[PDB]
Amino acid sequence: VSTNLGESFMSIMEQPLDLTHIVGTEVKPNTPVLMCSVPGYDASGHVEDLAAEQNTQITSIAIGSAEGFNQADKAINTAVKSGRWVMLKNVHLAPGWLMQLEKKLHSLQPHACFRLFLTMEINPKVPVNLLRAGRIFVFEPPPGVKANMLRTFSSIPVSRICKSPNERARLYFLLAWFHAIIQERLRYAPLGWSKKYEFGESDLRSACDTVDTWLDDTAKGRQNISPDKIPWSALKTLMAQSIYGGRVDNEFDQRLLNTFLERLFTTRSFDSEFKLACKVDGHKDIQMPDGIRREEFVQWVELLPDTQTPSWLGLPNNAERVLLTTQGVDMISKMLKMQMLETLHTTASNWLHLIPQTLSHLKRTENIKDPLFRFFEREVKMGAKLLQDVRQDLADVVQVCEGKKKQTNYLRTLINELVKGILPRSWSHYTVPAGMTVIQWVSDFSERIKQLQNISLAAASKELKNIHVCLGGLFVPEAYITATRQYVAQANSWSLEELCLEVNVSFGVTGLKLQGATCNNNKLSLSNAISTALPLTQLRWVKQSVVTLPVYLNFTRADLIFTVDFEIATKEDPRSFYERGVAVLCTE
Amino acid sequence: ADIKHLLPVETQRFQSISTEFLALMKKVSKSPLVMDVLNIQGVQRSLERLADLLGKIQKALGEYLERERSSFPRFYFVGDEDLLEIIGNSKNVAKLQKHFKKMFAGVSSIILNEDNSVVLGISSREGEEVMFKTPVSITEHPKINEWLTLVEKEMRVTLAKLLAESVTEVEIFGKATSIDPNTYITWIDKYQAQLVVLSAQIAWSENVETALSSAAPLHSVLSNVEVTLNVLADSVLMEQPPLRRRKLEHLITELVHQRDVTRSLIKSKIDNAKSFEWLSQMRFYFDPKQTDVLQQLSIQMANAKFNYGFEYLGVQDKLVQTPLTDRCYLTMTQALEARLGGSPFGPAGTGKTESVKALGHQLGRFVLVFNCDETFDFQAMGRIFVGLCQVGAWGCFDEFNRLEERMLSAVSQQVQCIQEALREHSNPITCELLNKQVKVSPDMAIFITMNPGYAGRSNLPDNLKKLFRSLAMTKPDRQLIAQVMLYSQGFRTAEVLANKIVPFFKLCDEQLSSQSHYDFGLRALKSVLVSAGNVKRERIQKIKREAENLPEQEILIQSVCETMVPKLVAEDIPLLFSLLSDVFPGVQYHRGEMTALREELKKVCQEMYLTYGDGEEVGGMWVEKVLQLYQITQINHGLMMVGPSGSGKSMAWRVLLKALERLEGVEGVAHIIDPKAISKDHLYGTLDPNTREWTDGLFTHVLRKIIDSVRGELQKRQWIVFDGDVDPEWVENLNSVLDDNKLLTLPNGERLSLPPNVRIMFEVQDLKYATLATVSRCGMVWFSEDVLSTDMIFNNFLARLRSIPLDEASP
Numbered sequence A: 001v002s003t004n005l006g007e008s009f010m011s012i013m014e015q016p017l018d019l020t021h022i023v024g025t026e027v028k029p030n031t032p033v034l035m036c037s038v039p040g041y042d043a044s045g046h047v048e049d050l051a052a053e054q055n056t057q058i059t060s061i062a063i064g065s066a067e068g069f070n071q072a073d074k075a076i077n078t079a080v081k082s083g084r085w086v087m088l089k090n091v092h093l094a095p096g097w098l099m100q101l102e103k104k105l106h107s108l109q110p111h112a113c114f115r116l117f118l119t120m121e122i123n124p125k126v127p128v129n130l131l132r133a134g135r136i137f138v139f140e141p142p143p144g145v146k147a148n149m150l151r152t153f154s155s156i157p158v159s160r161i162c163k164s165p166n167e168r169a170r171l172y173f174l175l176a177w178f179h180a181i182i183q184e185r186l187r188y189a190p191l192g193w194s195k196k197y198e199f200g201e202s203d204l205r206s207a208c209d210t211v212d213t214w215l216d217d218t219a220k221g222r223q224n225i226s227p228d229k230i231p232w233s234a235l236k237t238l239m240a241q242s243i244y245g246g247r248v249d250n251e252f253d254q255r256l257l258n259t260f261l262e263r264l265f266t267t268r269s270f271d272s273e274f275k276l277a278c279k280v281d282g283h284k285d286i287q288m289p290d291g292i293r294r295e296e297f298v299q300w301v302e303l304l305p306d307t308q309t310p311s312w313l314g315l316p317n318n319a320e321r322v323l324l325t326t327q328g329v330d331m332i333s334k335m336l337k338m339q340m341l342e343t344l345h346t347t348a349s350n351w352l353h354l355i356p357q358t359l360s361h362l363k364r365t366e367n368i369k370d371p372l373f374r375f376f377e378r379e380v381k382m383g384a385k386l387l388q389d390v391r392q393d394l395a396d397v398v399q400v401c402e403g404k405k406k407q408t409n410y411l412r413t414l415i416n417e418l419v420k421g422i423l424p425r426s427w428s429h430y431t432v433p434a435g436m437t438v439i440q441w442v443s444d445f446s447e448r449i450k451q452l453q454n455i456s457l458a459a460a461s462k463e464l465k466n467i468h469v470c471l472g473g474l475f476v477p478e479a480y481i482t483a484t485r486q487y488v489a490q491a492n493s494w495s496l497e498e499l500c501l502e503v504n505v506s507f508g509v510t511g512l513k514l515q516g517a518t519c520n521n522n523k524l525s526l527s528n529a530i531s532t533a534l535p536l537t538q539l540r541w542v543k544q545s546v547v548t549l550p551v552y553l554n555f556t557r558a559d560l561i562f563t564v565d566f567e568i569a570t571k572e573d574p575r576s577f578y579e580r581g582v583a584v585l586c587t588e
Numbered sequence B: 001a002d003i004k005h006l007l008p009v010e011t012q013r014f015q016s017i018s019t020e021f022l023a024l025m026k027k028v029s030k031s032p033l034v035m036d037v038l039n040i041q042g043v044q045r046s047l048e049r050l051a052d053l054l055g056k057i058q059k060a061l062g063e064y065l066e067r068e069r070s071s072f073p074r075f076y077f078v079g080d081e082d083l084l085e086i087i088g089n090s091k092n093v094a095k096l097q098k099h100f101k102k103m104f105a106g107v108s109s110i111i112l113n114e115d116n117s118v119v120l121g122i123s124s125r126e127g128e129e130v131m132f133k134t135p136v137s138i139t140e141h142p143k144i145n146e147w148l149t150l151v152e153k154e155m156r157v158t159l160a161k162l163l164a165e166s167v168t169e170v171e172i173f174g175k176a177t178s179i180d181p182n183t184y185i186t187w188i189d190k191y192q193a194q195l196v197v198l199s200a201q202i203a204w205s206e207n208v209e210t211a212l213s214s215a216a217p218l219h220s221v222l223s224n225v226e227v228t229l230n231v232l233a234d235s236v237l238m239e240q241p242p243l244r245r246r247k248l249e250h251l252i253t254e255l256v257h258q259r260d261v262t263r264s265l266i267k268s269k270i271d272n273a274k275s276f277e278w279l280s281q282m283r284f285y286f287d288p289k290q291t292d293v294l295q296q297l298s299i300q301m302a303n304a305k306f307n308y309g310f311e312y313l314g315v316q317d318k319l320v321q322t323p324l325t326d327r328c329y330l331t332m333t334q335a336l337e338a339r340l341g342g343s344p345f346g347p348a349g350t351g352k353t354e355s356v357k358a359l360g361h362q363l364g365r366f367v368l369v370f371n372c373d374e375t376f377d378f379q380a381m382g383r384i385f386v387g388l389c390q391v392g393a394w395g396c397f398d399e400f401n402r403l404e405e406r407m408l409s410a411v412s413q414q415v416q417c418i419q420e421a422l423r424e425h426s427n428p429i430t431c432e433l434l435n436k437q438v439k440v441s442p443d444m445a446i447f448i449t450m451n452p453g454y455a456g457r458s459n460l461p462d463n464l465k466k467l468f469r470s471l472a473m474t475k476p477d478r479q480l481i482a483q484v485m486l487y488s489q490g491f492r493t494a495e496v497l498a499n500k501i502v503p504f505f506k507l508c509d510e511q512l513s514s515q516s517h518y519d520f521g522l523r524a525l526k527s528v529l530v531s532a533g534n535v536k537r538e539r540i541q542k543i544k545r546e547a548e549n550l551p552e553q554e555i556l557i558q559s560v561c562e563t564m565v566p567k568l569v570a571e572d573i574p575l576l577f578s579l580l581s582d583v584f585p586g587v588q589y590h591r592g593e594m595t596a597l598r599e600e601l602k603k604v605c606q607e608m609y610l611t612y613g614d615g616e617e618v619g620g621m622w623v624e625k626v627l628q629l630y631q632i633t634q635i636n637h638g639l640m641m642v643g644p645s646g647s648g649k650s651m652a653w654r655v656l657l658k659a660l661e662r663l664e665g666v667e668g669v670a671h672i673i674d675p676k677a678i679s680k681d682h683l684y685g686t687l688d689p690n691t692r693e694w695t696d697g698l699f700t701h702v703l704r705k706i707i708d709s710v711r712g713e714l715q716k717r718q719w720i721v722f723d724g725d726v727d728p729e730w731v732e733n734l735n736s737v738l739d740d741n742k743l744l745t746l747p748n749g750e751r752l753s754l755p756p757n758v759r760i761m762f763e764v765q766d767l768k769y770a771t772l773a774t775v776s777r778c779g780m781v782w783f784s785e786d787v788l789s790t791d792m793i794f795n796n797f798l799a800r801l802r803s804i805p806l807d808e809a810s811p
C-alpha cells in the first residue's frame, strides 16, 4: 500500500487522534459524535479535557434510569436552544431510547455550535439507525510502543512536566516507557501476561500523580535533584503494590512486574548509555536518550523506527508469529467476504460410527491404606463412569439416527450439540482448555482412557511406584502430587509440612513441556523454539542461580498445579527468564 | 411543633382517636376484672377501627420523617416505624435504648440516673462502659436532635481524653525494661479495648521513631516488645474474665504484628525515619501540646495523613495483620488520599469486607456494610449516600457487581459527584444528590466488594471503574493468621499447631472428592480455630473442676472432626481420617458424652413413632447425624441439611428441636418458608417507585416479629428453615446475615440485626447452583441416602398402622 499510494498514506493513523479540529469543523451540529470504545477503555476523559481546553460547558448524564432520560431530554433541549454541549455516557444500555433519540435528533434543527457526544461499548445492541446517523469514532489501546508513548505525552500537559526540578521530565519518560511496555504486553497473551489485565489510563494518571507527589516531597523547590536522592524505592514499592500491582493476581505476574520495575527504575542513577531493551540479539539495542527536556524526549519518541519486534517488550521474537498469521488470514477472509458481494444425519451417523472405536472398556481395580492406590482407584472409577456415560450416549444417538428409538429432550439436545460440534455440557467433567472442540476432546478422552487402562493393568500386577504417569492425562494432577507426598511421608515416617520438591530430568512424571527454553543436564537455557518436550521428569521429596517456574495445566495458563525449581546456566539471567515468560506445560 | 398547621385532617383524626382511646381507658379502668372488660360488646370492632385509623394516620404522617432526618445526621439509618416510635417516645427516653445500635457504631445503650434527666455515659453490647467527663443535661429540656448531638460530641471528647490519659500511662510504663503484670492488668481493666490497642500502637510508633532518629535503640525496642509479648502470653495462659480475655487477645495480636514489623525493619539496615521501609508501615503520632483534643492523634501512611474519628466501637473483633492485609491497607489508604473509593476484589472468603471494616475501625470511623442486590435502585442509593454524607461514615457495599448495569451506570454519576465534592474539600461545602444539595463531611469513604465471575453477575461500566482503585487479593496468609490466632487464644505449641493445620486443609481441599457443598478455605479455618479455642477452654474448666498440661493436639483434632466430619460424604470419612492420622501421628479420637440428650431423643422418637439406634443399631447413623446437627447448632449460625430427598433431614431437625426443648425447658418455634413458592420480591419485600414506602416480605416480617418480641420471642428458640432448593437469585441477600455482621440490609437503608437465639437453616437437596459465597458461610450436615434405611420406614409405617386409627379399643 505504501508503494501504491505513497509512504505516508497510513501515517496519520499512528498519530494521536486530533479531536479538536474534527469536532469543530467536520461534525455537523445535528450529527451526534458517536464514540465507541472497546471494553476496558473509556473515552469520557478525552471529551472532558477537550471541553476544559475549549472552555465550554457540558452536562454529562449517565444513561440508564428514567430520571437520567428526563435529564438528557432537558439538557438536549436547552443545548439546542442555547448552544452548549451535551454528553450522554453509556448509551448502549438503552437501544429502545436511542431510537427516538435518533428520531428527535433528525426532527430538530440545532444551534451551530452544538455537539452531542454518545459514548458506548462496542455492542450489537446499538441501533443501526443511530450508527448511520452519527459520526463513529472507535477508541482502542494504541498500537505500537511509539504510538503508545506519543498518546501518553499528548495526554500529559506540558506545564505539568516542565515544572521544577528538571529530572521530572526523565522520570515521566521512564514512566511512559514502562506503561507502554506493560500495555503492549497484553496483546501477546498468555506469554506477556497470564491474564488480560485492565492497565488503562487511570493507572497512568495515578502513577503520574504519585511521581509528582513524591518528587515534591523530596525537593523543597530545588531546581535539580541528584539521581541518588530520588525516591526510587518509594516509587517502585508504591507502583508495585498499589497502582499497577492492584490488578495483579498471580505471584508470577507480580514477579514479572517487580522485575520490570527494578530493571527500569534505577538507570544506574541516570547514567548515560542505559540500555532500555534488546531489539535484536545481533548488534541491536535501544538506548536511553541523553537529553533533559520534554521536547527532546518527544523528539526521541518520534524518531523511533516504524519496525517493531516483540523483543522490544522483553518477549521472544516469535511471540507475534501465530497472531500475525491469524490476522493475515483474517484479512484474506475479509477480502473474500468483500468480493462475495461483487442427508446431514447420514453423515452425522457416519461420524458417530467412526468415533467410538477408540474406546473399548475400563476396569475398576477396594480396601487398602496406600494413598497412591486409593487415588488411582478413584481416578479409574471416575474414568469408567465417564466412559460408560459417553458410550451409552453414543449408542443412543446411533439408535435415534438409524434404528428403533425415539428422540427425547436430552437426546435432541445432544444431537444439536454434536451437530454444532461443540462440547455438550454433560460430558465436560474434567478440565478443557478454553472450550476445545469435540474432535480433539474425543482424542483426549481416548488418550486418558488408554492411560487409565495401563494404570489398571499395572495395579492388577511396590508395583505402583515404578510406573510412569502422564500429568496431562489425569482428571486432577494436584491430587496425584499430594498423594505422592503423602506416600513418601508415610513410607519414611516424616512430617508432611516439612517436605519440599526437587526436579531432575523418585517418581516419574511424563508429558511435561517447556515454553521457550531447553534443558541440558538439568541446566536451563533460553531458546528461540516455541516449546521443547521434556523426556522424563523425576520428582524426589526431601526434607531439605536457580529460577522458579510455573507448571500450568494447559496452553491457556489458567490453572496452576505446582512450581518447579531449575538450575540456570552460567551465562543466562533470571530476570531475562522471568521477562520472556518461560513456563512449563503438562499437555499440548 | 406546628403539627396542627401542616396536617389538619391528620390532626382531626388524631383527636378523634385520642377521644376514643380516652373512652377506652376510662371503661377499662372502671372495671379491672378481665371478665368485666370482656363483658362490653363491640370491643373487638372498636379495637379494629382504632388500629385501622392508627395505620392510616401513620401512613399519611410519613412525610415528616425526612424532615426529622434532615436535622440530626444519624437519623438516616433507621426505618419509618422505629423512627416514629423514637419521636413519639422522646420523653420516655428509657425505651430508646434498643434503637441506638443502628444509630451508632457500638453504642448499644446509654447510661442514665434515677431522675432520668442526665446521661451519665454510654455502654456497648458486651458490658463495656464509658463514663462521661462532663455529662449532658436534659433538665434544660432541649430537643432530641440537640441533646443527641451533644451526647455524640461529648462521647468523642471523652474518648479523646481517655486516650490521652491512657497513652501517658503507657509512656510511663515503657520507660522500664522489666514490667509488672499486676500493673499491666490493672491498666488493661482501667481502659477500654479500643483505647488500649490505640495506646499500644502509639507507644510503639513513638519508640520506633525515636530509635530511628538515632542499631542499639531498635534492638531495645524489639526486646521491649518481646518482653511485653511474653507477659501477655503468661497472663493469657491462666484463667481470665471474658472481656479482659478479649482485651488481652487484641493486645497479643497487635503486639505480635508490631514485633514482626520491627523484626523486618531490623533485618535490613534503616538509618533515617524518611526511609520508605518505615514510611510504608502504619504509623501513629500523638501531640500533647495540641489545643484541640479531637486533633491530638494523627494516623499516617505513605504520604497519607488521617485523623482519628473517635467513634466508639465497643470491643468487636481484631483481624490478624497479615502482609496481604498490610498491602490492602496501603492500597486503600492511597486511594483515600487520592480521594478515590477503594474496591478490593477476588474469590469469596479472602477477607475483603472484614479488611475494609478493620481499616475503618483502625481509623476510628463508622462503617456500614450493605449486601446490595438487583433491587437497590437509584433512589435507594441516593438516600443511603446522602445519609452517609450527613453522618460522615464509611460505606462497604458488598457484592456490587449484582446491581443491574443501567442502575450501576446511574449510580456512577452520584459517585463522581461525591468524589468531586471531596476533592473540593481537600482544596458550607455541598453536592447535588437526588436533586438536592447535601452537606458532605470530610470523613467520606465509599468501598466496593466484588466477586467477578460468581454467578454470571453484571460488570461495572468503565466510567465507574475509573472511580475506584482496584485491589486483587486471592491468597491470604493462612499460616500467619492461624499462628497468631492460636497464640492469642493461648497455646504452648501454637506455631506447631498452625504449621500442622494449614497444610492439612491445603491437602484436604484438593485430595477429597469434588462435591458442591465443600469449603476448606479461610472461613472454615477460622471456624475450626474458634471452636478449638472454645473446646480448649471447656476442657480446661472440666479438668480444673476436679496450670497443668493439656493435649492441644487432641483439642485441635477434636475441633477439626467436630466441624468438618458432618459435611463429608460416606466415602471421604476414611480419607479424612487417614489424612488426620498422617498429619498427626499420635492423633487419637473420642466422642459421645451426650447421654441425657441421647435418652431424651430416644423418648421423643418413641413418642412420635420413629426408630432409634444406639450408634450401631438400625437407627444409629440417623441418631449420630442428629447429634452432629446439634453440635453444629452449638458452634455455628447457618446450617444446610444437604442430602437426597428421603434421608430423614426433616424428622431429624424436628426431633432435635423437640429434644432440645425437653432438655433446656425453652420452647422451640419453627418457621418453614419455601423460597421458591413465592417470588423473591414477595419473600423479601417490595419498594414502591411512586412513594418510597417499604412493605415486609415473609422472611423480613418473621425477623421483625422476632426482633420486636411482643409475645416474648427472644426468650424462646426460633429456628427458620428454608425448605426449598437454593440458587444465588435470593440466597445472596443472606450473605451478610451469615457473616460476622449478623444483620440483614434492606433497600430502604435500615439494618436488621439478628438476635443470638435465631438460627437460619436450609433443607436443600442439591447444591449444583449455589455459589461459594453461600456454601462458605454455612456449616453443612450431609444427610446421605443410606442414613434412612428402608426398614426404619417400614417400622414407622407399622407403628402408625398399630396406633392412630384411620377414622380420626375401637374396632
Ligand SMILES: Nc1ncnc2c1ncn2[C@@H]1O[C@H](COP(=O)(O)OP(=O)(O)OP(=O)(O)O)[C@@H](O)[C@H]1O
Pocket: B609, B610, B611, B612, B619, B622, B644, B645, B646, B647, B648, B649, B650, B651, B652, B763, B765, B788, B792, B793, B795, B796, B797
Ligand atoms: N428415624 C426414622 N425412623 C423411621 N422412619 C423415619 C425416620 N426418619 C424419617 N422417617 C420416615 O421418612 C419419611 C420422610 O422423611 P422426612 O419427612 O424427614 O423427609 P426428608 O428426608 O427431609 O425429605 P425431603 O427432602 O424430600 O423433604 C417420614 O415421613 C418418616 O415416615
Ligand SMILES: Nc1ncnc2c1ncn2[C@@H]1O[C@H](COP(=O)(O)OP(=O)(O)O)[C@@H](O)[C@H]1O
Pocket: B318, B319, B320, B321, B322, B325, B347, B348, B349, B350, B351, B352, B353, B354, B355, B398, B449, B476, B481, B522, B523, B526, B739, B740
Ligand atoms: N487477617 C484476618 N484476621 C482475622 N480474621 C480474618 C482475616 N482475614 C479474614 N478473616 C476472616 O475470614 C472471613 C472472610 O470473610 P470475607 O471474605 O471478609 O467476607 P466477604 O467475602 O463478604 O468479604 C471473615 O469472617 C474474617 O473473620
Ligand SMILES: [Mg+2]
Pocket: B352, B353, B398, B399, B449
Ligand atoms: Mg464481601
Ligand SMILES: [Mg+2]
Pocket: B649, B650, B651, B763
Ligand atoms: Mg424433608
